[PDB]
């Protein structure tokens, strides 16, 4: 119900879902578009107990997709509760 009147859909993809699993758990993504290719990374980190905890980790990539559209803004979606 998030969208309405889906029209001339030019790309789709379905696979195993992204978000796997006391401590608030932190998950690391990078969203980046290069010459039409939309690159998606991933990483998961358990974090004890706001602030970003001073530490170091690395992010693996997941998949890249050639959406090939012009992007200038982004709006992160979230649930009510």
């Amino acid at each position: 119900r998030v969208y309405s009147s889906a029209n001339n859909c030019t790309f789709e993809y379905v696979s195993q879902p992204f978000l796997m699993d006391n401590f608030k758990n932190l998950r690391e993504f990078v969203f980046k578009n290069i010459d039409g290719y939309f690159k998606i990374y991933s990483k998961h980190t358990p974090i004890i107990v706001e602030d970003l905890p001073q530490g170091f980790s690395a992010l693996e990539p997941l998949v890249d997709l050639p959406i090939g559209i012009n992007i200038t803004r982004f709006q992160t979606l979230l649930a009510l509760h």
């Binding site: 010459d35 039409g36 290719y37 050639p66 090939g68 559209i69 012009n70």
Partner: peptide, 27 residues
């Protein structure tokens, strides 16, 4: 006339960018 093309636009396109205009008279 099922094929059309563009020759007027504000700026040039991006690599691998599909911007969605006049038609060719293919005879």
């Amino acid at each position: 006339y099922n094929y059309l093309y563009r020759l007027f636009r504000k700026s040039n396109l991006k690599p691998f960018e599909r911007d969605i205009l006049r038609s060719y008279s293919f005879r």
